[PDB]
């Protein structure tokens, strides 16, 4: 998967789309606008390098390269930004609907062939490589052309041509007074006709709920940190790739701006002599360190050369039982090692054999690891990792090796000596009861970083000039009320059984 994903939001501008079934309900047009805005915000937060477009059909005015009738391309394929969101915001309400009607109009005819032609033309203009081509149809008219059959045939032919080109088509059908029926006309235009998507739907599509669900977490495409060589010995070498399945998420780096006109500035660092005033490059100056009441002077090149031990890669040392590995010896986040057949042919077979035998014998490969040049070596353990799938066969644990760093003698710290006091069985039983009362299931994606979420919310509020920032609920805060209700009296019994009458833990 290489390139960018392009999406086009086709929104019908027919009269039937501007009628609300109930007074306290959202019109289909407003729902489509809200979905587009949500997708825009999600793309800005997650993938800012993607391309989006917004096109309307069935209007009175037109704006397109080919100069068709009743097709107004509101926004062409361009990276998302706050300006487009603000522009779309002027159609959200009823006054926005009036503004949209005045600007473009509604109630005119249209031909789906022209719409698809305009979409294809928009796709062709983009110069960047596009991994995905996608179009979404926000409409509530299952029979766009019932009076004319030639128009339907032309639309079918254009949809087929687009499908052959490699353009995905999706139908976000909206509520209809009568009921949407895909079988009428949209069975062929839509790229994939699901078996369940054949009955008459009396409610908006379920995909709108997914679209409205804002995702405020960055998405990174698969990439290899390094492509190194595993050396069983001097003459047996295979090629492996290293990946970081877990990586800390950081706020985007701040940028320095000028106060007067918000124009970015450039920061430069320089070093000058005090007694002469001249400028010194980072080669005239030396390095120093005061040991034993004396000064030791080393050049920069020598200082860098102090760290040269061995060439980059992994060197095999032996195999160790997994029992000897310790959980509390954590030093650094682990990495993932996978075969890489491009550099060396035959690496995959040996890697698979090693993984199978390591799983069978429950052993881990001890290795010496050197990520880059002029970096001191470390001792790592490659633990086999089998392929684990979930109920729906979606892979949850890939096959390969888990690279875990092992601490040196300097990475451990001595602990103060503390006398051991053992609790009586009754206290342990009461604590067991409390623990059982406070039991819950844990998942790796059950928590979110409050700082990053609040930062994203504040940034969006500032960019869109919203009245107040949206407040993010913190799921990491203990539920004091629920815990108190569940525990009941157990806390009092434990405190009576473990603490003297006058202890005052807080004090």
């Amino acid at each position: 998967y290489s390139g960018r994903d392009s999406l086009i939001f086709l929104v019908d501008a027919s009269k039937a789309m501007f009628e609300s079934q109930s007074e306290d309900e959202l019109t289909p047009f407003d729902m489509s606008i809200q979905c587009i805005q949500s997708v825009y915000i999600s793309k800005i937060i997650s993938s800012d390098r993607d391309l989006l477009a917004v096109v309307f059909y069935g209007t009175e005015k037109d704006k397109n390269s080919v100069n068709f009738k009743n097709i107004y391309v509101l926004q062409e394929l361009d990276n998302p930004g706050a300006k487009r969101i603000l522009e779309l915001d002027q159609f959200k309400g009823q006054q926005g609907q009036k503004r949209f009607q005045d600007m473009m109009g509604h109630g005119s005819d249209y031909s789906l062939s022209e719409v698809l032609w305009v979409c294809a033309n928009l796709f062709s203009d983009v110069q960047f490589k596009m991994s995905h081509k996608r179009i979404m149809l926000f409409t509530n008219e299952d029979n766009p052309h019932g009076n004319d059959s030639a128009k339907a045939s032309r639309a079918r032919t254009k949809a087929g041509d687009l499908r052959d080109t490699g353009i995905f088509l999706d139908l976000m059908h909206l509520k209809k007074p009568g009921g949407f029926d895909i079988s009428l006309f949209y069975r062929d235009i839509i790229s994939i006709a699901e078996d369940e998507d054949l009955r008459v739907h009396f409610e908006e599509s379920s995909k709108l709920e997914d679209l409205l669900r804002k995702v405020r977490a960055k998405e990174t495409r698969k990439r290899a940190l390094s492509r190194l060589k595993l050396k069983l010995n001097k003459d047996i070498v295979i090629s492996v790739g290293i990946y970081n399945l877990v990586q800390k998420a950081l706020k985007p780096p701040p940028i320095k701006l000028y106060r007067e006109t918000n124009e970015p500035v450039k920061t430069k660092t320089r070093t000058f002599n005090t007694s002469t005033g001249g400028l010194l490059l980072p080669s005239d100056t030396k390095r120093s360190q005061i040991y034993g009441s004396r000064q030791i002077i080393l050049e920069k090149e020598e200082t860098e050369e102090l760290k040269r031990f061995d060439d980059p890669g992994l060197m095999l040392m032996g195999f160790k039982p997994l029992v000897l590995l310790k959980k509390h010896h954590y030093l650094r986040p682990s990495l993932f090692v996978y075969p890489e057949e491009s550099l060396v042919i035959g690496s995959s077979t040996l890697f698979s054999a090693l993984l199978i035998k390591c799983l069978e014998k429950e052993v881990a490969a001890l290795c010496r690891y050197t990520p880059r040049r002029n970096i001191p070596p470390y001792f790592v353990a490659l633990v086999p990792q089998e392929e684990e799938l979930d109920d729906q066969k979606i892979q949850v644990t890939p096959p390969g090796f888990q690279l875990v760093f092992l601490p040196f003698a300097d990475d451990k710290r001595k602990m103060p000596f503390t006398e051991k006091i053992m609790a009586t069985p009754e206290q342990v039983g009461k604590m067991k009861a409390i623990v059982e009362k406070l039991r819950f299931t844990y998942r790796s994606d059950s928590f979110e970083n409050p700082v990053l979420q609040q930062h994203f919310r504040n940034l969006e509020a500032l960019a869109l000039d919203l009245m107040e920032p949206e407040q993010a609920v913190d799921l990491t805060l203990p539920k004091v009320e629920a815990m108190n209700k569940r525990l009941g009296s157990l806390v009092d019994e434990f405190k009576e059984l473990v603490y003297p009458p006058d202890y005052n833990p807080e004090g």
């Binding site: 000058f272 007694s275 002469t276 005033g277 001249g278």
Partner: protein, 96 residues
Amino acid sequence: FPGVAIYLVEPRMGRSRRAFLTGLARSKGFRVLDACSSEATHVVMEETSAEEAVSWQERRMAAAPPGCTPPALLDISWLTESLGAGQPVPVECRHR
């Protein structure tokens, strides 16, 4: 050494660098003119090419009295060497 005059071009080296250089020159005994004047005899540039230097010379002459001696174009190396030695240094072709 009141005989010689030294001027530093502000718009190409920065305010902080110019201030530091003027302070060092003053502490070393050199007299540096804060503002451009006809009495200036040496002009020092910083990170500049020949074309920009000649254009600056033309601009300065455009608002200078006739029958005078325009300063000589010099590089920052000359000023740094003079400050290091503590006394004015002879001018060579490289500095010009």
